[PDB]
Amino acid sequence: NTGLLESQLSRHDQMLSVHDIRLADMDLRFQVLETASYNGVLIWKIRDYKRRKQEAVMGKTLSLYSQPFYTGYFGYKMCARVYLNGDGMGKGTHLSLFFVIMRGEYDALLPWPFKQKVTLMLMDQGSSRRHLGDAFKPDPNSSSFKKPTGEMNIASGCPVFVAQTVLENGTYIKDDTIFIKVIVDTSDLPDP
Protein backbone atom coordinates (compact mmCIF):
# COMPACT_ATOMS: atom_id res chain seq x y z
CA ASN A 1 0.00 0.00 0.00
CA THR A 2 0.90 3.73 -0.04
CA GLY A 3 0.12 3.81 3.67
CA LEU A 4 3.42 1.94 3.90
CA LEU A 5 5.37 4.64 2.04
CA GLU A 6 3.78 7.32 4.18
CA SER A 7 4.45 5.39 7.39
CA GLN A 8 8.08 5.02 6.42
CA LEU A 9 8.32 8.72 5.56
CA SER A 10 6.82 9.52 8.95
CA ARG A 11 9.30 7.23 10.73
CA HIS A 12 12.17 8.96 8.95
CA ASP A 13 10.90 12.48 9.60
CA GLN A 14 10.46 11.64 13.27
CA MET A 15 14.04 10.37 13.51
CA LEU A 16 15.46 13.26 11.49
CA SER A 17 13.85 15.52 14.13
CA VAL A 18 15.55 13.69 16.99
CA HIS A 19 18.90 13.74 15.20
CA ASP A 20 18.59 17.56 14.95
CA ILE A 21 18.25 17.96 18.70
CA ARG A 22 21.01 15.41 19.31
CA LEU A 23 23.16 17.56 17.02
CA ALA A 24 22.18 20.89 18.63
CA ASP A 25 22.84 19.46 22.08
CA MET A 26 26.33 18.42 21.04
CA ASP A 27 27.10 21.89 19.71
CA LEU A 28 26.22 23.13 23.17
CA ARG A 29 28.25 20.33 24.78
CA PHE A 30 31.26 21.22 22.61
CA GLN A 31 31.02 24.83 23.70
CA VAL A 32 30.89 23.95 27.38
CA LEU A 33 34.02 21.80 27.04
CA GLU A 34 35.94 24.25 24.88
CA THR A 35 35.50 26.75 27.71
CA ALA A 36 36.26 24.45 30.66
CA SER A 37 39.00 25.19 33.23
CA TYR A 38 40.77 23.00 35.82
CA ASN A 39 42.79 25.38 37.95
CA GLY A 40 39.90 26.83 39.93
CA VAL A 41 39.63 29.98 37.82
CA LEU A 42 36.70 31.02 35.67
CA ILE A 43 36.54 33.75 33.05
CA TRP A 44 32.92 34.14 32.01
CA LYS A 45 32.19 36.19 28.90
CA ILE A 46 28.71 37.67 28.55
CA ARG A 47 27.74 39.05 25.12
CA ASP A 48 24.53 41.06 24.40
CA TYR A 49 24.48 42.97 27.67
CA LYS A 50 21.68 45.30 26.55
CA ARG A 51 19.25 42.62 25.40
CA ARG A 52 20.02 40.37 28.36
CA LYS A 53 19.72 43.27 30.81
CA GLN A 54 16.35 44.12 29.30
CA GLU A 55 15.18 40.53 29.57
CA ALA A 56 16.09 40.60 33.26
CA VAL A 57 13.88 43.65 33.73
CA MET A 58 11.06 42.24 31.61
CA GLY A 59 11.31 39.19 33.81
CA LYS A 60 12.02 36.99 30.79
CA THR A 61 15.36 35.80 32.16
CA LEU A 62 16.30 36.79 35.70
CA SER A 63 19.70 35.09 35.90
CA LEU A 64 22.48 33.50 33.83
CA TYR A 65 24.95 30.71 34.52
CA SER A 66 28.59 30.32 33.51
CA GLN A 67 29.81 27.03 32.09
CA PRO A 68 31.16 24.81 34.89
CA PHE A 69 34.79 25.13 36.02
CA TYR A 70 36.95 22.92 38.26
CA THR A 71 39.54 23.15 41.02
CA GLY A 72 41.23 20.18 39.37
CA TYR A 73 40.79 17.40 36.82
CA PHE A 74 38.66 15.42 39.27
CA GLY A 75 37.78 18.05 41.85
CA TYR A 76 34.77 20.15 42.72
CA LYS A 77 32.55 21.18 39.84
CA MET A 78 31.38 24.76 40.29
CA CYS A 79 29.99 27.72 38.34
CA ALA A 80 28.58 31.22 38.58
CA ARG A 81 25.17 32.79 38.46
CA VAL A 82 24.50 36.43 37.72
CA TYR A 83 21.35 38.56 37.83
CA LEU A 84 21.87 41.44 35.42
CA ASN A 85 19.08 43.36 37.12
CA GLY A 86 19.88 42.33 40.68
CA ASP A 87 18.46 39.88 43.18
CA GLY A 88 17.45 40.33 46.81
CA MET A 89 18.59 43.59 48.43
CA GLY A 90 20.26 44.68 45.18
CA LYS A 91 17.28 43.88 42.98
CA GLY A 92 16.60 46.61 40.44
CA THR A 93 19.53 48.63 41.78
CA HIS A 94 22.60 46.39 41.41
CA LEU A 95 24.02 43.42 39.55
CA SER A 96 24.08 40.35 41.81
CA LEU A 97 26.87 37.81 41.43
CA PHE A 98 26.82 34.41 43.09
CA PHE A 99 29.01 31.28 43.39
CA VAL A 100 27.50 27.82 42.84
CA ILE A 101 28.59 24.33 43.80
CA MET A 102 27.36 21.70 41.40
CA ARG A 103 27.10 17.98 42.00
CA GLY A 104 30.47 16.70 40.88
CA GLU A 105 30.96 13.13 39.72
CA TYR A 106 33.70 12.65 42.35
CA ASP A 107 32.16 14.27 45.44
CA ALA A 108 32.48 10.95 47.22
CA LEU A 109 36.22 11.65 47.34
CA LEU A 110 36.12 15.40 47.99
CA PRO A 111 36.11 17.07 51.45
CA TRP A 112 32.78 18.50 52.65
CA PRO A 113 31.60 21.02 53.30
CA PHE A 114 33.39 23.14 50.68
CA LYS A 115 36.00 25.32 52.41
CA GLN A 116 38.02 26.89 49.56
CA LYS A 117 38.21 30.70 49.45
CA VAL A 118 36.23 32.28 46.61
CA THR A 119 36.96 35.51 44.84
CA LEU A 120 34.23 37.06 42.71
CA MET A 121 34.91 39.88 40.29
CA LEU A 122 33.96 41.90 37.23
CA MET A 123 36.75 42.99 34.89
CA ASP A 124 37.44 46.53 33.71
CA GLN A 125 38.07 46.60 29.96
CA GLY A 126 39.33 50.18 30.14
CA SER A 127 43.11 50.58 29.99
CA SER A 128 43.24 51.69 33.64
CA ARG A 129 42.21 48.14 34.60
CA ARG A 130 40.27 49.02 37.75
CA HIS A 131 38.61 45.64 38.22
CA LEU A 132 35.85 45.13 40.78
CA GLY A 133 35.84 42.16 43.10
CA ASP A 134 35.36 40.74 46.56
CA ALA A 135 36.22 37.42 48.21
CA PHE A 136 34.87 35.28 51.03
CA LYS A 137 35.46 32.10 53.01
CA PRO A 138 32.62 29.57 52.74
CA ASP A 139 30.47 29.35 55.87
CA PRO A 140 30.66 25.71 57.10
CA ASN A 141 27.05 25.84 58.32
CA SER A 142 25.77 27.16 54.98
CA SER A 143 23.71 24.75 52.88
CA SER A 144 25.54 26.06 49.83
CA PHE A 145 28.80 24.34 50.67
CA LYS A 146 27.57 20.90 51.71
CA LYS A 147 27.90 17.72 49.61
CA PRO A 148 25.53 18.35 46.67
CA THR A 149 22.22 16.47 46.62
CA GLY A 150 20.52 17.90 43.57
CA GLU A 151 22.24 19.19 40.45
CA MET A 152 23.32 22.47 42.09
CA ASN A 153 23.34 23.81 45.65
CA ILE A 154 22.03 27.21 46.79
CA ALA A 155 23.98 30.06 45.11
CA SER A 156 25.94 32.16 47.60
CA GLY A 157 27.60 35.51 46.94
CA CYS A 158 26.94 39.24 46.77
CA PRO A 159 23.40 40.59 45.99
CA VAL A 160 24.79 44.12 46.04
CA PHE A 161 27.94 43.44 44.06
CA VAL A 162 27.89 46.54 41.87
CA ALA A 163 25.49 49.45 41.49
CA GLN A 164 23.88 49.10 38.05
CA THR A 165 24.79 52.76 37.40
CA VAL A 166 28.47 52.33 38.29
CA LEU A 167 28.53 49.31 36.00
CA GLU A 168 26.94 51.03 33.03
CA ASN A 169 28.86 54.29 33.45
CA GLY A 170 32.37 52.88 33.81
CA THR A 171 34.52 51.11 31.21
CA TYR A 172 33.37 47.65 32.34
CA ILE A 173 31.15 47.30 29.30
CA LYS A 174 32.69 47.38 25.83
CA ASP A 175 31.19 46.17 22.58
CA ASP A 176 28.01 45.14 24.41
CA THR A 177 29.81 42.55 26.54
CA ILE A 178 31.22 42.16 30.05
CA PHE A 179 33.60 39.70 31.68
CA ILE A 180 33.14 37.97 35.03
CA LYS A 181 35.98 36.19 36.81
CA VAL A 182 35.90 33.71 39.71
CA ILE A 183 38.98 32.54 41.60
CA VAL A 184 38.72 29.56 43.92
CA ASP A 185 41.68 28.88 46.21
CA THR A 186 43.07 25.41 45.54
CA SER A 187 46.62 25.54 46.92
CA ASP A 188 45.31 25.10 50.46
CA LEU A 189 43.94 21.57 50.10
CA PRO A 190 45.49 18.09 49.79
CA ASP A 191 45.60 17.57 46.01
CA PRO A 192 45.27 14.14 44.32
Binding site: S63, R81, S96, S144, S156, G157
Partner: peptide, 7 residues
Protein backbone atom coordinates in the same frame (compact mmCIF):
# COMPACT_ATOMS: atom_id res chain seq x y z
CA UNK B 1 28.49 35.27 51.83
CA UNK B 2 24.80 35.98 51.15
CA UNK B 3 22.42 33.59 49.39
CA UNK B 4 20.23 34.20 46.31
CA UNK B 5 16.44 34.27 46.44
CA UNK B 6 15.10 30.71 46.08
CA UNK B 7 14.29 30.89 42.33
Amino acid sequence: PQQATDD
